[PDB]
């Protein structure tokens, strides 16, 4: 599994987006395009996240 750490807050704009806060750890579910990935948060919510706002987390 791949997890990322949010570097910035993301409020979301489109219905499909997953909003998150700086420091949130998100699971990556799939990578449909280079800069937008499908992720899930600890509350079970799913949606698209901007790849430039996150960092690999180990």
């Amino acid at each position: 599994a791949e997890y990322v750490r949010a570097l910035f807050d993301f409020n979301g704009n489109d219905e499909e987006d997953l909003p998150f806060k700086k420091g949130d750890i998100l699971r990556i579910r799939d990578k449909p395009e280079e800069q937008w990935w499908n992720a899930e948060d600890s509350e079970g919510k799913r949606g698209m996240i901007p790849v430039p706002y996150v960092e690999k987390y180990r």
């Binding site: 489109d14 990578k31 449909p32 395009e33 800069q35 937008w36 698209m48 790849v51 430039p52 706002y53």
Partner: peptide, 13 residues
């Protein structure tokens, strides 16, 4: 590093 611009959404796989 600052904060990078929000990326455009493109055609998906």
């Amino acid at each position: 590093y600052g904060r990078p611009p929000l990326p455009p959404k493109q055609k998906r796989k």
